Amino acid sequence: AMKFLVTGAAGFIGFHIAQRLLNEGHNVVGIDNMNDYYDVSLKQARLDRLAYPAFHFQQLDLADREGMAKLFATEQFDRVIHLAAQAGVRLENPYAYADANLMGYLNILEGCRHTKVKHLVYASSSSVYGLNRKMPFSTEDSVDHPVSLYAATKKANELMAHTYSHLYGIPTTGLRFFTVYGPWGRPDMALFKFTKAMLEGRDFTYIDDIVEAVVRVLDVIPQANADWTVESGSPATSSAPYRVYNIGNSSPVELMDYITALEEALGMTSADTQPLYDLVGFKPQTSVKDGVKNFVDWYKDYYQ
Amino acid sequence: AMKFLVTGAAGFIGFHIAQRLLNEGHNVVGIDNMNDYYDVSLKQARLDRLAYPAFHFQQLDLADREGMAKLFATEQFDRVIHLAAQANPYAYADANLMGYLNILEGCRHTKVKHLVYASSSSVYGLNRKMPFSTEDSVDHPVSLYAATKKANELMAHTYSHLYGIPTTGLRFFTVYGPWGRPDMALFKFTKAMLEGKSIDVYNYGKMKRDFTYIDDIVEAVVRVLDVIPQANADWTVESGSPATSSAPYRVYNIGNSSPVELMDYITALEEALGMEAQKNMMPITSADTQPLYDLVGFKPQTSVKDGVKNFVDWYKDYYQI
């Protein structure tokens, strides 16, 4: 079987990707540092649901140079899906972003270089669009004006990916994420905060739709293009085997619809995502009603 | 008096910037980790020539978070000229990514009034349209060094935007002159010549390298340090460039438009050293500096003829040739 590394495997998206890859018969190695940015017991709960014979978990920090080098050298991964990062756009704790998103990403790249990983798929962010105002945001647009350190680190990942694709031939695909929600979600994002505070005192994609797109992209390996030039190409293409795509749900939905969906279930800025829907022949088809219902059902089940 | 931090102060460019600032009457703190990428005795020799009462040196690594914080906290700098960098992939990350964040944090928390920092022409990457302009996209780097320099520009943009720290990045091409670095420019050729090593020569020696004499770089940088970028509510991405912003953020090319080709430098060195260089012929570019001309009202004045003579005068004396 193929051997995949899923980083951030105890996290929201990593858990779902690892779970899907395991259900498809692959060998999966998961790593996560189980940091306390949010409830570590939630991460542990996710990690407990990945107990499969073909799943191996290693608590490892991305910034651990020797540890990371050893992991790559020993496992000889076929592909890597890199999701571990310090997320959240919203100034306090800059060193966490440098550690995880800059140094940590270079260690991923070094691992891929030394062991000739066949495809590295990694998480970028819509925040790279920064001060841009021309809508819908497109990967053909310049992304030079980030307004958060988090965004700057994600663009730096794309630049580093380009460098490694060009020098070493490692195929890379960066995915610019918008807002993801669903069961086993993040405590620090809106949908969860609301549900919790509500019980006490935008571009949204349901997690299953994200998983489906990422697993298809993992199988589409970028190839070199000797005819590509900067002057007639894009910041998301290259002569190197390098690609960047927006991932999301191009649907007109303001924040109030989801707020209304919560109250219904509890009883009390645009983006061009067409290049990805084409490449993999899939488009998100989960309705806000079903999505929030799945979240609340999970929320109530898990927390009560 | 004003107090400046010069990082990389025992290095080539940093030494010259610190020396000039001291000669203008300013207070300067120089830092360097004295690494052995090239001869540490040369770095110490530069540091010896910065012995002035208004100069203080601290051996400090850019990646030492607590050490960097202590430096900024105790000194309360008015301005910073950041030149220290690796130019081992982990060295680039340490010095050029984490180290740059320590600089930005220091500037943020102590309200430094202007941060000038070294970028590089390598950010132009796969670009082919000449001349290279700061209006051009710089999304396709071909080296980790280049990617880290573009990352510095991105990080500078975010700090200028969020905290109002004025930042000016300078995309250097090639610099040469007295107290230069042994691995580059005229020093590289001179060393090769005196050791009987062959110099690789591309495109019949007609490659137009962008070489600027150190004194011309120093004059420009010291003028730039005094031009503080301002916020601009009229700027938009759609009508702007990767080197401008609504934030007090600017990036400029710094270099020499002279049409002198590589062979002009080699021939001049041969004459100055009184010998002929061994050459290996390899079987079978320009930059726009108008924005810095409109900004500081100064262009490079040193000819190749004089620059080469200046270099050789330094080299012979320092190495007791």
Ligand SMILES: NC(=O)c1ccc[n+]([C@@H]2O[C@H](COP(=O)([O-])OP(=O)(O)OC[C@H]3O[C@@H](n4cnc5c(N)ncnc54)[C@H](O)[C@@H]3O)[C@@H](O)[C@H]2O)c1
């Ligand atoms: N969920 C979203 O809406 C969203 C939006 C934009 C971008 N992203 C990106 O997608 C990826 C996954 O996000 P998520 O929502 O699952 O976040 P998450 O925080 O739930 O998952 C990330 C996991 O990475 C791990 N991690 C962080 N730093 C680490 C380090 N230094 N070493 C090892 N492990 C480390 C964390 O412990 C966590 O479990 C991230 O790169 C994030 O930037 C997500």
Ligand SMILES: NC(=O)c1ccc[n+]([C@@H]2O[C@H](COP(=O)([O-])OP(=O)(O)OC[C@H]3O[C@@H](n4cnc5c(N)ncnc54)[C@H](O)[C@@H]3O)[C@@H](O)[C@H]2O)c1
């Ligand atoms: N010389 C050129 O032609 C040229 C061209 C393009 C860019 N630059 C840039 O200009 C800057 C100055 O370069 P230079 O040519 O004077 O090089 P240099 O190597 O002579 O000087 C740099 C100094 O930085 C110090 N340093 C490196 N890493 C450090 C760390 N982690 N902590 C503390 N000190 C550290 C070194 O010890 C060195 O003395 C660099 O940022 C470089 O990328 C120079």
Ligand SMILES: [Cl-]
């Ligand atoms: Cl030189």
